[PDB]
């Protein structure tokens, strides 16, 4: 039919979001849940937004592929993760979480990843320190959100909100190529814990990739 909003555990993810920081417009690629290993306890919801130009970019290699084919093609997610377009990730809590509580397990996966690809030098350790620091003064009562703005120019912007509305400014800009893609790498890349996100993107992209390009209006 047409692109749609996704609701996760009562956390609405709009079909379209426009960034107040770069003016770029994104479309919902998919949403997912993320919880713990104790009974599986769901803690947060996650939505991956891709800039509208991402469609033209992915078109040549992926238009025509079925959702079944996309889901199994690791190379599909590498074009999503490292594609020449901005990505926006919004994590919204189901269960209250302080900055550090949350930033804790996010940095875990990120540090691991960077280590397994040989890109975790001082610069990378420094950037992750700035990342931890941006989360310290923040708290995430259910409904509250963190917006990771992954710039194509190697910037990772960090925004925090009381609800699911997008902030007008960012609390921090982390300038490191490897780290900029790390967060998205941990959610939809090869060694992603939960399939939820990868499955959702495989499901909703085929419809789009076939309509050529896609511009979220003037």
mmCIF file of C-alpha atoms in Angstrom:
data_model
loop_
_atom_site.group_PDB
_atom_site.id
_atom_site.type_symbol
_atom_site.label_atom_id
_atom_site.label_comp_id
_atom_site.label_asym_id
_atom_site.label_seq_id
_atom_site.Cartn_x
_atom_site.Cartn_y
_atom_site.Cartn_z
ATOM 1 C CA UNK A 1 0.000 0.000 0.000
ATOM 2 C CA UNK A 2 1.936 2.999 1.228
ATOM 3 C CA UNK A 3 4.558 3.625 3.899
ATOM 4 C CA UNK A 4 3.234 3.433 7.452
ATOM 5 C CA UNK A 5 3.758 4.174 11.116
ATOM 6 C CA UNK A 6 4.850 1.363 13.407
ATOM 7 C CA UNK A 7 3.770 0.893 16.996
ATOM 8 C CA UNK A 8 5.925 -1.087 19.416
ATOM 9 C CA UNK A 9 4.656 -1.969 22.903
ATOM 10 C CA UNK A 10 2.657 1.279 22.705
ATOM 11 C CA UNK A 11 5.536 3.335 21.296
ATOM 12 C CA UNK A 12 4.488 5.002 18.037
ATOM 13 C CA UNK A 13 7.050 5.480 15.271
ATOM 14 C CA UNK A 14 5.816 8.013 12.681
ATOM 15 C CA UNK A 15 6.131 7.027 9.007
ATOM 16 C CA UNK A 16 8.060 10.212 8.330
ATOM 17 C CA UNK A 17 10.291 12.448 10.425
ATOM 18 C CA UNK A 18 12.153 15.573 9.433
ATOM 19 C CA UNK A 19 15.360 16.529 11.196
ATOM 20 C CA UNK A 20 15.463 20.073 12.770
ATOM 21 C CA UNK A 21 19.289 19.877 12.665
ATOM 22 C CA UNK A 22 20.034 19.073 9.037
ATOM 23 C CA UNK A 23 16.669 19.653 7.353
ATOM 24 C CA UNK A 24 16.825 16.164 5.853
ATOM 25 C CA UNK A 25 13.717 13.990 5.813
ATOM 26 C CA UNK A 26 13.615 10.321 6.707
ATOM 27 C CA UNK A 27 11.123 7.451 6.226
ATOM 28 C CA UNK A 28 10.592 4.610 8.743
ATOM 29 C CA UNK A 29 12.607 1.611 7.620
ATOM 30 C CA UNK A 30 11.554 -0.564 10.505
ATOM 31 C CA UNK A 31 11.048 -0.754 14.251
ATOM 32 C CA UNK A 32 11.956 -3.369 16.834
ATOM 33 C CA UNK A 33 12.123 -4.331 20.483
ATOM 34 C CA UNK A 34 15.204 -4.818 22.626
ATOM 35 C CA UNK A 35 15.326 -6.444 26.026
ATOM 36 C CA UNK A 36 17.319 -8.545 28.440
ATOM 37 C CA UNK A 37 18.637 -12.133 28.893
ATOM 38 C CA UNK A 38 17.682 -12.845 32.574
ATOM 39 C CA UNK A 39 12.402 -14.621 30.878
ATOM 40 C CA UNK A 40 13.021 -12.066 28.131
ATOM 41 C CA UNK A 41 12.384 -8.595 29.582
ATOM 42 C CA UNK A 42 11.644 -5.889 26.995
ATOM 43 C CA UNK A 43 13.359 -2.609 27.860
ATOM 44 C CA UNK A 44 13.370 -0.402 24.771
ATOM 45 C CA UNK A 45 11.876 0.055 21.307
ATOM 46 C CA UNK A 46 14.007 1.076 18.355
ATOM 47 C CA UNK A 47 13.235 2.664 15.038
ATOM 48 C CA UNK A 48 15.653 3.062 12.158
ATOM 49 C CA UNK A 49 14.873 5.933 9.846
ATOM 50 C CA UNK A 50 16.573 6.295 6.471
ATOM 51 C CA UNK A 51 16.884 9.530 4.506
ATOM 52 C CA UNK A 52 14.550 9.598 1.495
ATOM 53 C CA UNK A 53 17.458 9.545 -0.982
ATOM 54 C CA UNK A 54 18.404 6.176 0.446
ATOM 55 C CA UNK A 55 15.819 4.674 -1.936
ATOM 56 C CA UNK A 56 17.553 5.774 -5.164
ATOM 57 C CA UNK A 57 20.894 4.758 -3.638
ATOM 58 C CA UNK A 58 19.739 1.187 -2.844
ATOM 59 C CA UNK A 59 17.580 0.884 -5.974
ATOM 60 C CA UNK A 60 20.179 -0.468 -8.445
ATOM 61 C CA UNK A 61 21.400 -3.320 -6.255
ATOM 62 C CA UNK A 62 18.191 -4.237 -4.525
ATOM 63 C CA UNK A 63 15.082 -3.308 -6.510
ATOM 64 C CA UNK A 64 13.431 -6.532 -7.637
ATOM 65 C CA UNK A 65 14.657 -8.593 -4.668
ATOM 66 C CA UNK A 66 12.055 -10.220 -2.449
ATOM 67 C CA UNK A 67 11.833 -9.608 1.295
ATOM 68 C CA UNK A 68 12.897 -13.236 1.753
ATOM 69 C CA UNK A 69 16.010 -12.631 -0.366
ATOM 70 C CA UNK A 70 16.885 -9.335 1.317
ATOM 71 C CA UNK A 71 16.662 -10.718 4.817
ATOM 72 C CA UNK A 72 19.347 -13.311 4.026
ATOM 73 C CA UNK A 73 21.721 -10.970 2.202
ATOM 74 C CA UNK A 74 24.194 -9.493 4.658
ATOM 75 C CA UNK A 75 25.335 -7.162 1.895
ATOM 76 C CA UNK A 76 21.910 -5.536 1.937
ATOM 77 C CA UNK A 77 22.363 -4.333 5.487
ATOM 78 C CA UNK A 78 25.906 -3.143 4.757
ATOM 79 C CA UNK A 79 24.461 -0.715 2.197
ATOM 80 C CA UNK A 80 21.926 0.409 4.780
ATOM 81 C CA UNK A 81 24.542 0.711 7.508
ATOM 82 C CA UNK A 82 27.162 2.483 5.395
ATOM 83 C CA UNK A 83 25.016 3.996 2.634
ATOM 84 C CA UNK A 84 25.700 7.543 1.303
ATOM 85 C CA UNK A 85 22.792 9.087 3.158
ATOM 86 C CA UNK A 86 21.858 10.058 6.693
ATOM 87 C CA UNK A 87 20.263 7.559 9.057
ATOM 88 C CA UNK A 88 18.273 8.453 12.189
ATOM 89 C CA UNK A 89 17.818 5.994 15.051
ATOM 90 C CA UNK A 90 15.329 6.608 17.821
ATOM 91 C CA UNK A 91 15.378 4.504 20.950
ATOM 92 C CA UNK A 92 12.317 4.868 23.147
ATOM 93 C CA UNK A 93 12.089 3.281 26.591
ATOM 94 C CA UNK A 94 9.494 0.824 27.805
ATOM 95 C CA UNK A 95 11.126 0.669 31.214
ATOM 96 C CA UNK A 96 12.810 3.599 32.934
ATOM 97 C CA UNK A 97 16.571 3.854 32.354
ATOM 98 C CA UNK A 98 19.175 6.375 33.502
ATOM 99 C CA UNK A 99 21.637 7.583 30.929
ATOM 100 C CA UNK A 100 24.542 5.387 32.176
ATOM 101 C CA UNK A 101 22.287 2.334 32.653
ATOM 102 C CA UNK A 102 21.350 2.614 28.970
ATOM 103 C CA UNK A 103 24.579 3.955 27.453
ATOM 104 C CA UNK A 104 26.279 1.079 29.264
ATOM 105 C CA UNK A 105 25.120 -1.824 27.121
ATOM 106 C CA UNK A 106 25.117 0.273 23.965
ATOM 107 C CA UNK A 107 28.814 0.999 24.297
ATOM 108 C CA UNK A 108 29.463 -2.666 25.063
ATOM 109 C CA UNK A 109 28.321 -3.862 21.649
ATOM 110 C CA UNK A 110 29.970 -0.863 20.002
ATOM 111 C CA UNK A 111 33.409 -1.397 21.561
ATOM 112 C CA UNK A 112 33.243 -5.089 20.746
ATOM 113 C CA UNK A 113 32.363 -4.373 17.114
ATOM 114 C CA UNK A 114 35.127 -1.838 16.612
ATOM 115 C CA UNK A 115 37.574 -4.325 18.121
ATOM 116 C CA UNK A 116 36.590 -7.120 15.721
ATOM 117 C CA UNK A 117 37.135 -4.938 12.658
ATOM 118 C CA UNK A 118 40.461 -3.512 13.765
ATOM 119 C CA UNK A 119 39.201 0.005 14.242
ATOM 120 C CA UNK A 120 39.444 0.864 17.909
ATOM 121 C CA UNK A 121 42.470 3.000 18.461
ATOM 122 C CA UNK A 122 42.848 5.962 20.784
ATOM 123 C CA UNK A 123 40.525 8.107 18.637
ATOM 124 C CA UNK A 124 37.890 5.404 18.904
ATOM 125 C CA UNK A 125 38.352 5.046 22.675
ATOM 126 C CA UNK A 126 38.209 8.841 23.008
ATOM 127 C CA UNK A 127 34.995 9.101 20.978
ATOM 128 C CA UNK A 128 33.345 6.433 23.096
ATOM 129 C CA UNK A 129 34.262 8.440 26.196
ATOM 130 C CA UNK A 130 32.532 11.478 24.752
ATOM 131 C CA UNK A 131 29.569 9.200 23.991
ATOM 132 C CA UNK A 132 29.324 7.947 27.595
ATOM 133 C CA UNK A 133 29.652 11.547 28.844
ATOM 134 C CA UNK A 134 26.737 12.800 26.710
ATOM 135 C CA UNK A 135 24.482 10.230 28.366
ATOM 136 C CA UNK A 136 25.405 10.977 32.023
ATOM 137 C CA UNK A 137 23.106 13.966 32.676
ATOM 138 C CA UNK A 138 20.118 12.222 31.028
ATOM 139 C CA UNK A 139 17.369 9.918 32.380
ATOM 140 C CA UNK A 140 14.898 7.844 30.347
ATOM 141 C CA UNK A 141 11.473 7.460 31.947
ATOM 142 C CA UNK A 142 9.205 5.252 29.806
ATOM 143 C CA UNK A 143 8.387 7.180 26.618
ATOM 144 C CA UNK A 144 11.644 9.196 26.688
ATOM 145 C CA UNK A 145 14.014 8.973 23.728
ATOM 146 C CA UNK A 146 17.553 9.080 22.405
ATOM 147 C CA UNK A 147 17.963 10.045 18.740
ATOM 148 C CA UNK A 148 21.194 8.877 17.093
ATOM 149 C CA UNK A 149 21.719 10.931 13.929
ATOM 150 C CA UNK A 150 24.192 9.094 11.767
ATOM 151 C CA UNK A 151 25.608 11.633 9.296
ATOM 152 C CA UNK A 152 27.088 10.382 6.001
ATOM 153 C CA UNK A 153 30.043 12.697 6.560
ATOM 154 C CA UNK A 154 31.169 10.663 9.566
ATOM 155 C CA UNK A 155 29.290 12.517 12.310
ATOM 156 C CA UNK A 156 27.189 10.897 15.031
ATOM 157 C CA UNK A 157 24.830 13.434 16.567
ATOM 158 C CA UNK A 158 23.195 12.751 19.902
ATOM 159 C CA UNK A 159 19.785 13.996 20.938
ATOM 160 C CA UNK A 160 17.709 13.255 24.045
ATOM 161 C CA UNK A 161 13.966 13.911 24.542
ATOM 162 C CA UNK A 162 11.332 13.630 27.363
ATOM 163 C CA UNK A 163 8.872 11.897 25.031
ATOM 164 C CA UNK A 164 9.096 10.642 21.433
ATOM 165 C CA UNK A 165 9.236 14.146 19.886
ATOM 166 C CA UNK A 166 12.422 15.091 18.072
ATOM 167 C CA UNK A 167 14.590 17.792 19.723
ATOM 168 C CA UNK A 168 15.580 21.010 17.953
ATOM 169 C CA UNK A 169 19.254 20.742 18.987
ATOM 170 C CA UNK A 170 21.770 17.983 19.720
ATOM 171 C CA UNK A 171 23.559 17.567 23.037
ATOM 172 C CA UNK A 172 26.643 16.263 21.287
ATOM 173 C CA UNK A 173 28.300 15.658 17.925
ATOM 174 C CA UNK A 174 30.752 12.778 17.888
ATOM 175 C CA UNK A 175 33.198 13.119 15.013
ATOM 176 C CA UNK A 176 34.533 9.628 14.250
ATOM 177 C CA UNK A 177 33.856 7.573 11.158
ATOM 178 C CA UNK A 178 33.997 4.097 12.717
ATOM 179 C CA UNK A 179 31.914 5.049 15.726
ATOM 180 C CA UNK A 180 29.331 6.883 13.605
ATOM 181 C CA UNK A 181 28.235 3.597 12.054
ATOM 182 C CA UNK A 182 28.822 1.469 15.126
ATOM 183 C CA UNK A 183 25.410 1.956 16.721
ATOM 184 C CA UNK A 184 23.491 0.970 13.567
ATOM 185 C CA UNK A 185 26.002 -1.814 13.001
ATOM 186 C CA UNK A 186 25.041 -3.295 16.364
ATOM 187 C CA UNK A 187 21.312 -3.288 15.540
ATOM 188 C CA UNK A 188 21.049 -4.551 11.938
ATOM 189 C CA UNK A 189 24.554 -5.781 11.107
ATOM 190 C CA UNK A 190 25.717 -9.386 10.813
ATOM 191 C CA UNK A 191 26.103 -10.040 14.536
ATOM 192 C CA UNK A 192 22.875 -8.346 15.635
ATOM 193 C CA UNK A 193 21.276 -9.896 18.704
ATOM 194 C CA UNK A 194 17.651 -9.642 17.616
ATOM 195 C CA UNK A 195 16.291 -10.156 14.055
ATOM 196 C CA UNK A 196 13.291 -7.869 14.627
ATOM 197 C CA UNK A 197 14.872 -4.850 12.882
ATOM 198 C CA UNK A 198 16.495 -6.703 9.999
ATOM 199 C CA UNK A 199 13.204 -8.480 9.301
ATOM 200 C CA UNK A 200 11.202 -5.246 9.311
ATOM 201 C CA UNK A 201 13.539 -3.497 6.827
ATOM 202 C CA UNK A 202 13.402 -6.483 4.493
ATOM 203 C CA UNK A 203 9.622 -6.292 4.649
ATOM 204 C CA UNK A 204 9.106 -2.579 3.984
ATOM 205 C CA UNK A 205 11.927 -1.744 1.520
ATOM 206 C CA UNK A 206 10.876 -3.861 -1.496
ATOM 207 C CA UNK A 207 7.679 -1.773 -1.886
ATOM 208 C CA UNK A 208 9.776 1.428 -1.987
ATOM 209 C CA UNK A 209 12.842 0.313 -3.932
ATOM 210 C CA UNK A 210 10.537 -0.348 -6.889
ATOM 211 C CA UNK A 211 9.022 3.118 -7.109
ATOM 212 C CA UNK A 212 12.338 4.369 -8.327
ATOM 213 C CA UNK A 213 13.385 7.261 -6.116
ATOM 214 C CA UNK A 214 11.372 8.838 -3.305
ATOM 215 C CA UNK A 215 11.263 12.435 -2.138
ATOM 216 C CA UNK A 216 9.532 13.490 1.043
ATOM 217 C CA UNK A 217 8.022 16.585 -0.421
ATOM 218 C CA UNK A 218 9.434 20.083 -0.771
#
